[PDB]
Amino acid sequence: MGPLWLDVAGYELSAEDREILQHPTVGGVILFGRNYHDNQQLLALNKAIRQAAKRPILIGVDQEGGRVQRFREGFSRIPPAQYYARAENGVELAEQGGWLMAAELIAHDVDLSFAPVLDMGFACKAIGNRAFGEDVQTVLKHSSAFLRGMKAVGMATTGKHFPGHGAVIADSHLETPYDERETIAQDMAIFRAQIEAGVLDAMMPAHVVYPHYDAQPASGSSYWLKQVLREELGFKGIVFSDDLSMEGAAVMGGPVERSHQALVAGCDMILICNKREAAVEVLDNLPIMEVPQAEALLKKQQFSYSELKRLERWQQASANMQRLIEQFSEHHH
Numbered sequence: 259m260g261p262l263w264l265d266v267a268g269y270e271l272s273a274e275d276r277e278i279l280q281h282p283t284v285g286g287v288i289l290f291g292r293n294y295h296d297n298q299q300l301l302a303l304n305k306a307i308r309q310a311a312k313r314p315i316l317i318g319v320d321q322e323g324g325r326v327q328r329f330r331e332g333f334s335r336i337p338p339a340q341y342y343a344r345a346e347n348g349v350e351l352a353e354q355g356g357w358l359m360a361a362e363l364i365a366h367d368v369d370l371s372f373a374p375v376l377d378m379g380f381a382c383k384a385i386g387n388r389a390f391g392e393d394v395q396t397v398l399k400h401s402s403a404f405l406r407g408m409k410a411v412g413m414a415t416t417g418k419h420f421p422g423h424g425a426v427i428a429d430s431h432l433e434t435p436y437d438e439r440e441t442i443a444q445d446m447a448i449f450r451a452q453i454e455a456g457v458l459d460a461m462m463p464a465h466v467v468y469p470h471y472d473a474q475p476a477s478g479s480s481y482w483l484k485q486v487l488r489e490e491l492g493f494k495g496i497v498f499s500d501d502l503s504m505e506g507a508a509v510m511g512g513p514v515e516r517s518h519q520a521l522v523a524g525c526d527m528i529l530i531c532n533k534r535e536a537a538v539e540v541l542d543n544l545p546i547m548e549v550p551q552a553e554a555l556l557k558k559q560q561f562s563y564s565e566l567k568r569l570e571r572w573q574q575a576s577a578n579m580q581r582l583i584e585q586f587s588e589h590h591h
């Protein structure tokens with residue numbers, strides 16, 4: 259596995275896709291809604307991806323629940339992460355949500371969901387009800403349960419967006435938001451806790467500048483990714499970059515330079531989404547490096563959707579998640 263996560267255009271692989279996936283710089287494919295038509299098509303696509311790579315390759319997706327669920331039709335709907343804490347039995351429900359989400363992905367030959375969100379609060383429009391709560395303890399109580407669910411079925415976990423994206427409430431009018439708070443201790447406490455617990459296999463940093471701490475976005479900052487994340491907090495897992503196709507070239511250079519800089523800053527792996535031309539430029543021009551420790555993120559269990567549906571745990575979780583959505587969704591009222 260190499261450092262690069264890239265994506266494909268549609269429901270099946272093109273000839274170019276099959277060629278690219280063999281490249282040693284590729285480590286993973288991130289799937290989007292545009293790669294999902296139906297359950298059988300998804301299984302076929304994932305088989306094809308793994309066959310084309312001719313070595314282990316990660317298949318990942320943003321499948322959080324609520325506003326962020328790429329595969330919906332023919333899957334169980336998972337609620338916004340916010341909903342668990344709104345119910346009296348929120349800890350049990352959060353575990354069910356994590357388990358169900360992860361299990362259905364595993365059953366369709368996906369390695370991992372980029373989850374959970376450990377951001378604090380609902381006031382950042384991009385985050386909102388993706389957060390488990392608005393205070394440290396509510397977020398920890400419910401995210402920990404969600405994590406336990408994911409781990410129960412052998413899915414690797416990813417905390418995001420380190421050191422916390424919950425309070426980005428102003429618009430910088432630039433490509434990189436700023437969070438101007440003099441202290442983000444509460445936000446970081448959540449990440450510290452989950453790292454110490456040993457329950458995060460990976461971390462995605464925030465593309466956010468925290469000027470009272472450091473001048474660079476966390477996702478491109480040695481301060482955040484090395485000094486804090488590694489040395490102070492003792493994180494031993496995989497660090498993913500921000501989506502590099504998002505970064506402008508006027509300051510950061512072209513996609514090859516941006517990839518290099520992310521890796522030097524402390525990322526293990528880099529993401530280039532929705533920009534095939536950039537991904538190919540990086541494959542064509544980035545010196546080859548291996549990320550063997552990424553193999554830790556490969557899913558640990560194998561089962562089919564038929565098998566999953568025969569489990570009481572599935573029958574209950576699916577019913578309970580639909581009911582939880584119905585309890586708090588404005589759409590269902």
Ligand SMILES: CC(=O)N[C@H]1/C(=N/OC(=O)Nc2ccccc2)O[C@H](CO)[C@@H](O)[C@@H]1O
Nearest residue numbers: 288320372384418419423462501503504531
């Ligand atoms: C803060 C946030 O929602 N980041 C998401 C995220 N955000 O990506 C962008 O914001 N990309 C972008 C934004 C503006 C212009 C071009 C790309 O991408 C990752 C992969 O899909 C997700 O795992 C992250 O959760």
